[PDB]
Design a protein around this ligand. Structure first.
Ligand SMILES: [Zn+2]
Lengths: 49, 100, 97, 407, 48
DNA sequence: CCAGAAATTGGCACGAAAATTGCAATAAATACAA
DNA sequence: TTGTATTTATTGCAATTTTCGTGCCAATTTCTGG
C-alpha cells in the first residue's frame, strides 16, 4: 500500500518505479538460483551475479 | 458486452431524465447546473448466477434494472451554463444514433 | 469480546526516543511475514493478486476487510482465523500498509 | 504413422491451447531456467464506499459502546447492494458478549436501517420496501393498498398473477394498477447510490477490420509473444574452455531455438485459423448475429488441412476484436436446425430472432412458445417447441404468464 | 487537520458534539518514513 | 360462477454428433570423415 | 564418392466425454360454456 499500482482509463494497470526495480531484482535472483542449481559454468554465473 | 449510451437509466428519477432526448443526450439550449446529467450511460455487470433473491428482484421490478450500472456524465460541482453544442464521434462499423 | 478488540486497535504507542542501527539478516527475517518469490503483481484474469508475488495476500494481508482470498471466511465472527486453503488471515485490509 | 510424439511435440502442441497470459507465465518460467533465452510519483485518492458512509453515520449517532460494537458488526455484513448478508444470530455470536439478547441487536438494526440511504441493511426485499414505504406521509393516495400488498402478498405479485391478487386484496383494476405502479416507483437496491468499481477489459489476440472494401485479419502486435537468443552467451560456445562448459551451452541453444520456432508456429496457426473463421463468417461482421452461419470444427479443419483437435486447441480462450465487439473465437461455432426447402439455420441466429420477437410483443398478452414457433415457421426455420423453450431459458426470459402486465 | 487518521474522525465527532478537544496521536507520514528507511536495510525503531 | 377441458411449462431420456484430451522418444535433410 | 552422425521437422490418432435437438409426460395455468 506504500507502492500502489496506478489504475487509469481503459484498464491499464501501469506499474511504478519501485515495482519495476523489485521485478528486476526478483528476476535476476530467480535466474541466479536456477543457474546455481544446474551447476552452470562460472563464466555465466559471474555475469549473473 | 459494450457500454450503452441511453436515456433508460433505472435507478434515477423521472425529473433528472427530463433534459435528455431519446438518445440519452442533453438538449441544445438546456440550462444546467452542478450535478445534472449530460450524457446517460450504463455499464454492464451481468452474470449467469441468479439466486432466488435476484429472481424476486427481476420479477417485481423488471429485468432492465438489473445487470446494469450507472456511469453517466454529470456536470461537475460548482459548474453551470447553457448547452450550446454537442459533438458525437462514432467508430467505423458502429451503428449511428439519431443525434449523430 | 468485540469491545476490547475494537478498542485495542485505536491505541497509540508510547515512546520517548528513536534508535537507529544496522539490520541483521535475522532482524530482516523477523520483520517479514513471508518471502516474495515471483515478480507477478496482478492476475489480470480474476484481477486478484498473484500468489507469492509483490502483492500477495498471504504475505501482506487481505485485500478486503475480514475476508480471505478464496472466500470461505468473510465476517467479523472469523476474525484472526488463518484460512487453510489460501493462507490469508481474516483481518483488516490496512495491515497492507 | 501416429506421428512420433516425443515429449517435445507434446509441449509444442500444449502451447496451442494456452491463453496469452498463461503463455506469458510459461515463457517466463522457461526464461528463468535457460540462460540463452531473453525477451525483446503516483499515490491515488481515497474513495468513500457505502460502508464508509454508514460508519461515518454510525460515528455521529448517540450509540453506547455495546450499541456501537453491534453497529460495527451490522455494517460489516452489508453488501454493495445494501442488503444484510448474515442472520442476526451470526451478528450476536460475533459480538462475543453473553449478556446481550436479540432485542438489542434488533433495535440497533432498526436504527441503522433509517440511515442514508433509507432501506439499507435490510434483511430481504419485503423489509426494504416496508422501510421505504414507512417514510412516506399518510397523504399518499394509495399508501395503504401498496403496504398491504407488500406485507402480505408479494410472492404472487412476483408470479404476475394480477387476478388472485384482486380476489384476496378485494380491489379494482384502476386501483391495483396504481398500487403496483407505486410499488415499482420504490428503489429496489438502496446501496447502489454510492457506486464504486471499474469495468474489466480484455486484450484481444487478433484484430479484424475493413480495408478498401474487404476484411483483413491480423494478430494484435501489442500482445504477441516473442523470444530472442542471447548472443553474449551464444558467442562463448566452442571457445577454449572446459568441455562441460561448452556442452552446457549447445544444449540450451538447441532448446531456445526450438522454443522460438514453436512460438512462431503457434502464432502462424492461430492467424490461419482466425483468417479462415473470418472468411467463413463474413455476413456476421456486416449484418449482425442474425446472419451467423452454422459452422463446426470439421468445417475449418478441411479449409486448412489440419485435424479437428488442432482447431479445438487453437480456438480455446483467445479473443477476437471486431467493430461489433470482442468475442472468444469459439462463439462462432454453433449447432443448427433444418430450414424450409433446404439449408441450416444457426442457433445464434435463432436466439437473436427469438429475442427480437419477444422484445416486440403485446404486453397485455405475451407470446407463448407455440406462438413463437409458429412465427419462426414463416421465415423457413423448423425449430421445435421444446428447443424454443430451451433457447428462451438460455436467454434468461420468464415464461409467458410471468411477462404479462396490467396495462 | 492532516495525516493522523484516527484523530481526524475523533475531532469531527467532538466538534459535532460541542466538545472542542483533540487527541493528537501519531502522523501517518512518519510511519511511512520508518517503513521506507527499514526497506533500505537500516533498523530504526521507537523505544520506551 | 364451477367443473372440465385445453393449453402451457420444464424435468428426464435417447441416440447421434460433436468436442475434448492423452499420448513420451521417429524420419528425412545435411554436413562430414574415409 | 559414400556410409554415418546431427539437426531439423513433426501440429495427428484414437479413445473418451460432453453436448446436441426433440420426444414423452406429469404438474401447473388459463379458457369456456353451460
Ligand atoms: Zn480462504
Amino acid at each position: 500500500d506504500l507502492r500502489p499500482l496506478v489504475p487509469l482509463d481503459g484498464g491499464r494497470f501501469a506499474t511504478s518505479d519501485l515495482n519495476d526495480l523489485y521485478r528486476r531484482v526478483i528476476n535476476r535472483n530467480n535466474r541466479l538460483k536456477r543457474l546455481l542449481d544446474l551447476a552452470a559454468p562460472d563464466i555465466i554465473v559471474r555475469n549473473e551475479k | 458486452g459494450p457500454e450503452e449510451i441511453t436515456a433508460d437509466i433505472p435507478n434515477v428519477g423521472e425529473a433528472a431524465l427530463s433534459k435528455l432526448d431519446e438518445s440519452g443526450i442533453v438538449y441544445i439550449g438546456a440550462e444546467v447546473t452542478g450535478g445534472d446529467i449530460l450524457v446517460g450511460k450504463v455499464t454492464p455487470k451481468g452474470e449467469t448466477q441468479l439466486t432466488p433473491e435476484e429472481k424476486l428482484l427481476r420479477a417485481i421490478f423488471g429485468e432492465k434494472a438489473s445487470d446494469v450500472k450507472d456511469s453517466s456524465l454529470r456536470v461537475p460541482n460548482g459548474v453551470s451554463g447553457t448547452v450550446i453544442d454537442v459533438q458525437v464521434f462514432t467508430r467505423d462499423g458502429v451503428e449511428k444514433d439519431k443525434r449523430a | 469480546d468485540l469491545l476490547k478488540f475494537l478498542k485495542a486497535q485505536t491505541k497509540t504507542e508510547e515512546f520517548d526516543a528513536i534508535k537507529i542501527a544496522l539490520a541483521s539478516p535475522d532482524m530482516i527475517r523477523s520483520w517479514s511475514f513471508g518471502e516474495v518469490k515471483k515478480p507477478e503483481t496482478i492476475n489480470y484474469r480474476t484481477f486478484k493478486p498473484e500468489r507469492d508475488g509483490l502483492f500477495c495476500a498471504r504475505i501482506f494481508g487481505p485485500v478486503k476487510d475480514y475476508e480471505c482470498l478464496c472466500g470461505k471466511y468473510k465476517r467479523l465472527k472469523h476474525r484472526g482465523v488463518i484460512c487453510e486453503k489460501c493462507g490469508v488471515e481474516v483481518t483488516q485490509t490496512k495491515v497492507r500498509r | 504413422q501416429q506421428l512420433a510424439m516425443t515429449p517435445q511435440l507434446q509441449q509444442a502442441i500444449r502451447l496451442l491451447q494456452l491463453s496469452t497470459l498463461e503463455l506469458q507465465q510459461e515463457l517466463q518460467q522457461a526464461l528463468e531456467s535457460n540462460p540463452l533465452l531473453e525477451q525483446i510519483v503516483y499515490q491515488g485518492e481515497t474513495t468513500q464506499t457505502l460502508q464508509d458512509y454508514l460508519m461515518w453515520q454510525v460515528e455521529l449517532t448517540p450509540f453506547s459502546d455495546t450499541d456501537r460494537a453491534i453497529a460495527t458488526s451490522i455494517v460489516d455484513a452489508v453488501d454493495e447492494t445494501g442488503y444484510l448478508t448474515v442472520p442476526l444470530e451470526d451478528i450476536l455470536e460475533s459480538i462475543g458478549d453473553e449478556e446481550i439478547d436479540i432485542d438489542e441487536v434488533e433495535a440497533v438494526l432498526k436504527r441503522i436501517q433509517r440511515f442514508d440511504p433509507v432501506g439499507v441493511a435490510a434483511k430481504d426485499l419485503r423489509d426494504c420496501l416496508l422501510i421505504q414505504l414507512s417514510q412516506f406521509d399518510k397523504t399518499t393516495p394509495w399508501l395503504e393498498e401498496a403496504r398491504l400488498i407488500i406485507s402480505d402478498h408479494l410472492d404472487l405479485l412476483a408470479n404476475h398473477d394480477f387476478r388472485t391478487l384482486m380476489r384476496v386484496t378485494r380491489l379494482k383494476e384502476d386501483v391495483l394498477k396504481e398500487a403496483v405502479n407505486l410499488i415499482q416507483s420504490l428503489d429496489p437496491r438502496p446501496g447502489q447510490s454510492i457506486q464504486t468499481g471499474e469495468p474489466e477489459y480484455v486484450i484481444p489476440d487478433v484484430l479484424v477490420r475493413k480495408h478498401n472494401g474487404h476484411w483483413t485479419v491480423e494478430l494484435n502486435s501489442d500482445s504477441i509473444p516473442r523470444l530472442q537468443i542471447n548472443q553474449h552467451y551464444a558467442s562463448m560456445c566452442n571457445n577454449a574452455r572446459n568441455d562441460g562448459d561448452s556442452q552446457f551451452i549447445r544444449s540450451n541453444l538447441q532448446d531456445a531455438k526450438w522454443l522460438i520456432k514453436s512460438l512462431e508456429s503457434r502464432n502462424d496457426t492461430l492467424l490461419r485459423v482466425s483468417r479462415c473463421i473470418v472468411e467463413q463468417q463474413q455476413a456476421f461482421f456486416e449484418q449482425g448475429e442474425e446472419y451467423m452461419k452454422p459452422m463446426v470444427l470439421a468445417d475449418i479443419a478441411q479449409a486448412v488441412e489440419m485435424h479437428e483437435s488442432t482447431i479445438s486447441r487453437v480456438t480455446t480462450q483467445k479473443y477476437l476484436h471486431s467493430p461489433r465487439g470482442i468475442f472468444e473465437l469459439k462463439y462462432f461455432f454453433s449447432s443448427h436446425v433444418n430450414t424450409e426447402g433446404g439449408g441450416e439455420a444457426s442457433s445464434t441466429a435463432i436466439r437473436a430472432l427469438v429475442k427480437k420477437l419477444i422484445a416486440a410483443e403485446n404486453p397485455a398478452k405475451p407470446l407463448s412458445d407455440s406462438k413463437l414457433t409458429s412465427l419462426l415457421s414463416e421465415q423457413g426455420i423448423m425449430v421445435a417447441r421444446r428447443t424454443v423453450a430451451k433457447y428462451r431459458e438460455s436467454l434468461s426470459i420468464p415464461p409467458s404468464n410471468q411477462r404479462k402486465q396490467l396495462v | 487537520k492532516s495525516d493522523d487518521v484516527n484523530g481526524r474522525t475523533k475531532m469531527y465527532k467532538n466538534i459535532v458534539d460541542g466538545n472542542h478537544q483533540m487527541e493528537p496521536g501519531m502522523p501517518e507520514s512518519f510511519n511511512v518514513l520508518l517503513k521506507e528507511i527499514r526497506s533500505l536495510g537500516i533498523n530504526i525503531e521507537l523505544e520506551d
